[PDB]
Structure 1
């Protein structure tokens, strides 16, 4: 308690000191000193990151190339130390981006490795994924390399929502149309199916799978291979349903598969599965009723299309 009273007065005094120096136009290393003592514990104090940038911008004008490189290397170390303490601060990640974007010869390979390290610690850190995308763009890293990165992350352990998300963005880049190709789609279906049969509680694979089911070319355009793959998925989900009777993701996916295969032919079973799913996932009853209503309306329209 008294230590907090100590820290508070130390931050307070350092803060006043920085503001005081700022009005005076004293853009020097003493400010870097003061802010380092505040930003470590309080990285969300954005005005202090602004002060550091004003100081660094000022100092580069009135110092040698070698002196400015030294200041930049000291900044990279300070930033890394801040990130280790709080890897989820917008201000710290932005300052690192601001810094790297103005360097003459930035080492992007080192930055990609920084990202790999932080993603080992927290594979869901969206600040780090965002930074990695920034570095990948700057360094002109190809989508295929990043696709390789995501697979290792997905297979080596769980916590995969962020990795699947990244794939959803990378795949369309490997096949850019101004809606994935079927060969690509079939491979992704295989990969994601492994995922949710490895961990059927992992919601992330199920969310990505629902996307892949929509990313096709249509039910009356079903190829023999895709038709067979989806029917196989359907049977494999029924298998899982036996092993995990409380698993709602597999029940929803069964409904979605029957939709993808033949809405009218599977109408009976679709309605049966809605009843089971609502029993198993009652908090979603309202959602499921609206989905069922939408499906029954689609079916009425399909039936009226009859010649």
Structure 2
């Protein structure tokens, strides 16, 4: 268990919750061994799964009941049970939106239906992502729904844009963009025009909020996702040099910002390792003073880059 702060009637209330939970659990298992796959099981498990959605066996019992009732109920009665189940799932998700069991039961349920309302499931996603934009369960469910409904990469890309601009907490939405972009193109590395548009979007982000670590992580990826030094186009070379000078300006505004310093080093690598060897080494020293916890990593990176440089000088 996570997040339980340490600090009679509080002790008593849960003493009474337990005996109810225990008797309800007792009752469920008795019915199950008796082969009573009926509505009373759904009533009993609803009482338990509300507070304790990680009790996986009880989700399995709900599924066994639903399967069994479907064979011996009418189509209209079966439909009614399904809608009741969706209501129950939504109320469970309101209480605990980060349980594997609940999200999976919803997928199981939706995967059985002809015909599910996927537009509505996508809206449910957007609501939960408004509450917590990093809920990976919800992003996973959205990817499941999008595939089911065959929503196109372009639509999902448009969704990620609004999310990134309306506020921070963007790591999950940048991650989604990194999977969407290669699909839009794709290949058996991003095309330069795409790459240049993304760089513009990401540099907006980390100048708008320089503490936003997600934009810096995504930017490091973009830097490696191109056709390479040195088939640097005139436009890419100009863009990167421009990014270099904007990072130095930001370094002036935010002198304890480690991300800007690391990015300068990476840009110089992307531009011309040997021409910038002196400056690269100066930046490593500044960076280690600013981010001492990463000193071992930074020394190893610098060692890698120094080897690269020796290899470049020897190809003369």
Question: Normalising by structure 1, what TM-score?
Answer: 1.00
**CA distance in structure 1 between the partners assigned to 2:227 and 2:31 by the alignment:** 64
Show CA shifts across 1:248-285 (max 9, x none): 00000000000000000000000000000000000000
Q: Residues of 1 paired with 2:227 and 2:309: CA distance?
A: 19
- How many aligned positions are there? 306
Runs of 5+ in structure 1 lacking a partner?
none
Once the two structures are superposed, residues 57-86 of structure 1 have per-residue CA deviations (whole angstroms, 9 ceiling, x without a partner) of 000000001000000000000000000000
Q: Which residue of 2 aligns with 1:293?
A: 303
- The correspondence of residues 266-277 of structure 1 with structure 2, limited to 5 A, is 266-277=276-287
* Structure 1 residue aligned with 2:127: 117
Query: How big is the shift at 1:189?
Result: 0.1
For the residues of structure 1 that align with 2:37 and 2:229, how far apart are their CA atoms? Answer: 66
* Residue in structure 1 matching 2:178, options 168, 182, 186: 168
Match of 1:143 among 153, 165, 170: 153
How far does residue 96 in structure 1 lie from its aligned partner after superposition?
0.1
Aligned-pair distance for 1:104?
Answer: 1.0
How far did 1:163 drift? 0.1
Counterpart Cα distance in 1 of 2:259 and 2:232: 24
Shift of 1:18: 0.2
List per-residue Cα deviations over 1:264-307 (Å, max 9, x = no partner). Answer: 0000000000000000000000000000000000000000000x
Between the aligned partners of 1:257 and 1:55, the Cα distance in structure 2 is 60
Specify which of 227, 231, 234 is matched with residue 221 of structure 1.
231
Which SS does the other structure have where 1:173 is aligned? Answer: coil
Q: Deviations over 1:98-120 (max 9, x none)?
A: 00000011000000000000000
Q: RMSD of aligned C-alpha atoms?
A: 0.3
Q: 2: distance between equivalents of 1:293 and 1:49?
A: 53
Cα deviations across residues 101-156 of structure 1 (Å, max 9, x unaligned)?
00011000000000000000000000000000000000000000000000000000
| Alignment correspondent of 1:256 | 266
**Alpha-carbon offset, residue 50 of structure 1:** 0.1
- For residue 52 of structure 1, report the CA deviation from its aligned partner: 0.1
2:190, 2:237 → 1: CA distance? 16
> For 1:46 and 1:257, how far apart are their aligned partners in 2?
49
User: Any runs of at least 4 consecutive aligned residues in structure 1 with deviations exceeding 4 A, and if so which?
Assistant: none
| Structure 2, gaps ≥5 residues long | 1-10
